[PDB]
Structure 1
């Protein structure tokens, strides 16, 4: 932040641009989520699924299957949302279409887990764009091996939510994730890394401006990009299981290779 000059003003314009398209691409923001989770919102208070009884009034193996079929459904519409946003990242549509598909191939699950944290508190998660709330302990209590399917998310979210990012912060963060230069099968790492470096400059200036009394928030955020890789691997391992135990075409395209 040290200087107010043309370079720092471009980085603010890039942050504004990302925020606006974020707001356009993501109906349920962290600000709206935090409002629903605190009772303040105008929107009719969401129904709380906390046991088998409350799940029935909301709508065993059938209870589990149904829940995971919604998570597959919402995850598909979540990929649409994130596709829209990526298109708004200055530069992104000027890379080999192959690289674009790649960057998004490996990106969506990391963003999903990132933005899922926005919908979470200690007690549980907002579902169906804020109309429901499903508790951590209920999800936990589901038949093995689906029973332990969100716990990693809740664990991630607890530590992620303690950073106290807002929508402005997350917009740039989410862009930094999509423009990851280490994804398999990238043709041109240079142009990708080049955009990410500018995004990383915009994030840093954003975190300095937005979190005055917040030590190494930049470093801690970049370390979260490490937690996310690990979480995505552990999901895949869990689905490598369901294959033998018990997805959606576009999720199958992403899980392949």
Structure 2
């Protein structure tokens, strides 16, 4: 258990670290998506020609490779954020690897929702915007690989969470005591209890009209687990189909077992 002023201090600590670790914030992403600004307007990629012009090997692959490159970048930013979570770096080292192995993907989809609306996703630190249409229309398995992310984002974004909320929620995901192969579950759950308490109080003060948002947000962790599972199975199909294509070692290790 934790006292109220301590929970507020924990939320601010985590928000502060989240700002320092993730360069493209939800607040910034929404300002770019909403427009009414002449200085932050993205170039829109909606077909092959605008893709060619936007840049100033096969297209579905190039886009896929672009996604993997950005995901590796996200794993780095998420890893840096995790170190800031009080108690994380004090855990057994093998458990640190384990929590990150199973948590980074759930966080990537979570934070990817910040870059999405129902019509597309921001890319290249907000400078570009690729339409859901164009991604959904990619050939072979790649088209169907993009759309389920949009489906989750539309539902997740309906919760209207801001960055200060997401900062604690991401922490809760990482500090999951039910990951396979964890050696010392007890110290992980003690931290998650602190984070969960901090999330609860945070949501109450920041969304007081939004009844049971706490519970509704935790139920979204179920959606996350599903899409991470869907993702892995699609990668295996691409691995057996496109054998000229290579994954980053960091990603390679993450998906082993």
Q: How would you bin the TM-score normalised by the shorter chain? A: over 0.9
CA contact (8 A) 1:61 1:143 kept: no
Cα distance change of structure 1 residues 109 and 229 upon mapping to structure 2, 3 Å threshold: same
* Matched residue count: 251
Question: 2:145 matched to 1:145?
Answer: no
CA contact (8 A) 2:32 2:40 kept: no
Aligned-partner Cα distance in 1 for 2:56–2:125 = 25
Give the superposed CA RMSD: 1.6
Cα distance change of structure 1 residues 175 and 142 upon mapping to structure 2, 3 Å threshold: same
Aligned-partner Cα distance in 2 for 1:59–1:170 = 32
1:148-206: per-residue Cα shift (whole Å, max 9, x none)? 11211101001100000000000000000000111111000000010000100000000
TM-score (norm 1): 0.95
CA contact (8 A) 2:45 2:130 kept: yes
Bigger Cα displacement from structure 2, 33-42 vs 148-157: 33-42
Question: 2:96 matched to 1:100?
Answer: yes
Residue 244 of structure 1 and its aligned partner are, at CA, apart by 1.2
- Please give the residue correspondences for 1:1-257 in structure 2 after superposition, counting only pairs within 5 Å: 7-41=3-37, 43-59=39-55, 62-246=58-242, 247-257=247-257
List 4+ stretches of structure 1 deviating above 2 A: 40-44
Aligned-partner Cα distance in 2 for 1:105–1:176 = 15
Residue 41 of structure 1 and its aligned partner are, at CA, apart by 4.8
Aligned-partner Cα distance in 2 for 1:154–1:148 = 11
